[PDB]
C-alpha cells in the first residue's frame, strides 16, 4: 500500500483511535499522539452509541463489534415535562437491542486502545506547532521531543489549533450553551430524578430549556442542561465556584418540579461550554505543502442535540482508512482529496439537520 512512511494521528479520541486501529490492521505505521497525561485518565461526559450503517461500520472492520456489544448497555428513553409527567417511553425491545447500546467514553477507549499494538498511542504529548519538512512534516509537543511524520492527520477535537494547513475557517459558538454535571449513587443522592429515570435516558423540554439525563454510566448519573446563550454573556457568571451556577439553574429551573430541583442541589461542580460548530462551508486549502487531513471533530464539530458525532467521525476514519489502502489511488493526496470529498457531502447535511433541529428545540417548543 502506499504507505511505506509513516502516520501521526494527533488526538486520542473514539475517532482518533479508531483511526489508528484501521491503518495498523493494514500494516500501516501509526502514532497517536494524545495529550492524556496517561491511559486512566478520566473521559467527561455521556455515553457514546454507535448506529448501524455508520459507527458500526467502523468497529465491525474494526472486528471489535462484539466486544462492543459486550460492554455497550442498551437503553429505553423517556420523555418527561417539567413536572415529572412521563410522557413518553420507549423501551429497549429484544430484537431491536443491538441498534445502540451506550457506551461509556472511557469504556470504549479500553476497547479501542486494546486493539492496538503495544505503544501505538504516545501519552502525555500535546501537539502545538506542525512545520512543513523538505519531504516530511515536524511536529512540536510541549515540552516534549519533536517528531517527524510523512501523512498528519488531524483528530484532536472540536477546537484544534493546528488547522491553518488545511483550512483558515474558524470555529464558531452557535447561538447555544451547555451545563452539565455527574451525581455518584444517584439512587441516595438524588433519589427522586433517578426513580424517575426509572432506568431508561430521561429527556424533558421546557420554554427553550433542555434537562438529558442518563442515570446509569458505569453507576453514575450524567446530566446535562441546555439553552439559548442568556443575551448578556458576550463571547458573564462564573462556573468555577457552584453557588454561583446553582442560582443560575434554580431560576431558570424555578417552574420545574422539585425532583429536577434536587438534581441542582446534589451536583458538587457543573461544567460550562458553548455549542460550537465548525462549519463545512467552503472547500478546504487545494494547496498543501505535504499530504495532511481532518477526521471527526476536527474536521466537521456539530451540535449534539441531533444524535450527531463519532458515528459521523467513525465512518471519516472508515473512509480515509480504505482510501489509503485499497491502492486506488496512485498518490497519497489523491486518496485524502477523495476521502474530503465524500466527507463533505454527509457533513455538510449532517450539519445541516443538527443545526436547524437545534433552532427546533430552544424556541419556544418541541416534542422530539
Ligand atoms: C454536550 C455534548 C454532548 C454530546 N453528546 C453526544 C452523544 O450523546 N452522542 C454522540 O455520538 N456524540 C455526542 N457529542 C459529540 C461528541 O462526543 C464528539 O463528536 C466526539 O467526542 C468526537 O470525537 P473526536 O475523536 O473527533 O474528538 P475528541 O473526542 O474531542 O478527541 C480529541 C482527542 O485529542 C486530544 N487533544 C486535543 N488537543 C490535542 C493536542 N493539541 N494534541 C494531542 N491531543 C489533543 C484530546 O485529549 C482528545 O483526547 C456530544 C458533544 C457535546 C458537547
Same mark, same amino acid.
Given at each position: 500500500?502506499?504507505? %511505506?512512511?509513516?502516520?501521526?494521528?494527533?488526538?486520542?479520541?473514539?475517532?482518533?483511535?479508531?483511526?489508528?486501529?484501521?491503518?495498523?490492521?493494514?500494516?500501516?505505521?501509526?502514532?497517536?499522539?494524545?495529550?492524556?497525561?496517561?491511559?486512566?485518565?478520566?473521559?467527561?461526559?455521556?455515553?457514546? %452509541?454507535?448506529?448501524?450503517?455508520?459507527?458500526? #461500520?467502523?468497529?465491525?472492520?474494526?472486528?471489535?463489534?462484539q466486544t462492543y456489544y459486550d460492554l455497550a448497555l442498551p437503553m429505553g428513553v423517556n420523555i418527561a415535562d417539567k413536572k415529572g409527567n412521563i410522557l413518553s417511553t420507549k423501551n429497549v425491545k429484544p430484537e431491536n437491542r443491538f441498534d445502540n447500546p451506550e457506551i461509556n467514553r472511557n469504556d470504549l477507549?479500553?476497547? $479501542?486502545?486494546?486493539?492496538? #499494538?503495544?505503544?501505538?498511542?504516545?501519552? %502525555?504529548?500535546?501537539?502545538?506547532?506542525?512545520?512543513?519538512?523538505?519531504?516530511?512534516?515536524?511536529?512540536t509537543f510541549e515540552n516534549k521531543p519533536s517528531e517527524t511524520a510523512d501523512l498528519v492527520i488531524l483528530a484532536n477535537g472540536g477546537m484544534?489549533?493546528?488547522?491553518?494547513?488545511?483550512?483558515?475557517?474558524?470555529?464558531?459558538?452557535?447561538?447555544?450553551?451547555?451545563?452539565?454535571? %455527574?451525581?455518584?449513587?444517584?439512587?441516595?443522592?438524588?433519589?427522586?430524578?433517578?426513580? $424517575?429515570?426509572?432506568?431508561?435516558?430521561?429527556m424533558a423540554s421546557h420554554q427553550?430549556?433542555?434537562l438529558f439525563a442518563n442515570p446509569n454510566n458505569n453507576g453514575a448519573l450524567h446530566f446535562g442542561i441546555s439553552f439559548k446563550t442568556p443575551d448578556e454573556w458576550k463571547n458573564q457568571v462564573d462556573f468555577q465556584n457552584?453557588?454561583?451556577?446553582?442560582?443560575?439553574?434554580?431560576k431558570k429551573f424555578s417552574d420545574w418540579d422539585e425532583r429536577y430541583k434536587?438534581?441542582?442541589?446534589?451536583?458538587?461542580?457543573?461544567?460550562?461550554?458553548?455549542?460550537?460548530?465548525?462549519?463545512?462551508?467552503?472547500?478546504?486549502?487545494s494547496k498543501r505543502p505535504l499530504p495532511i487531513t481532518?477526521?471527526?471533530?476536527?474536521?466537521?464539530?456539530?451540535?449534539p442535540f441531533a444524535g450527531q458525532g463519532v458515528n459521523s467521525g467513525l465512518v471519516d476514519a472508515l473512509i480515509l482508512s480504505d482510501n489509503l489502502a485499497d491502492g486506488k489511488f496512485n498518490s497519497i493526496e489523491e486518496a485524502v482529496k477523495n476521502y474530503e470529498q465524500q466527507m463533505f457531502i454527509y457533513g455538510k447535511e449532517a450539519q445541516e439537520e443538527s443545526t436547524q433541529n437545534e433552532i427546533e428545540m430552544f424556541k419556544p417548543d418541541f416534542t422530539f
Open positions: 500500500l502506499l504507505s %511505506d512512511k509513516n502516520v501521526a494521528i494527533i488526538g486520542g479520541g473514539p475517532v482518533g483511535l479508531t483511526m489508528a486501529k484501521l491503518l495498523q490492521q493494514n500494516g500501516i505505521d501509526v502514532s497517536v499522539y494524545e495529550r492524556d497525561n496517561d491511559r486512566e485518565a478520566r473521559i467527561f461526559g455521556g455515553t457514546l %452509541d454507535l448506529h448501524k450503517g455508520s459507527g458500526q #461500520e467502523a468497529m465491525k472492520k474494526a472486528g471489535l463489534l477507549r479500553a476497547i $479501542l486502545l486494546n486493539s492496538l #499494538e503495544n505503544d501505538t498511542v504516545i501519552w %502525555d504529548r500535546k501537539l502545538v506547532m506542525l512545520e512543513p519538512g523538505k519531504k516530511k512534516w515536524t511536529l484544534s489549533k493546528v488547522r491553518k494547513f488545511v483550512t483558515d475557517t474558524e470555529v464558531e459558538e452557535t447561538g447555544t450553551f451547555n451545563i452539565q454535571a %455527574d451525581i455518584h449513587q444517584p439512587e441516595i443522592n438524588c433519589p427522586g430524578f433517578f426513580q $424517575l429515570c426509572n432506568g431508561n435516558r430521561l427553550g430549556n433542555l457552584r453557588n454561583s451556577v446553582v442560582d443560575f439553574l434554580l434536587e438534581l441542582i442541589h446534589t451536583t458538587l461542580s457543573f461544567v460550562g461550554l458553548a455549542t460550537r460548530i465548525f462549519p463545512l462551508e467552503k472547500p478546504w486549502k481532518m477526521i471527526g471533530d476536527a474536521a466537521h464539530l456539530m451540535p
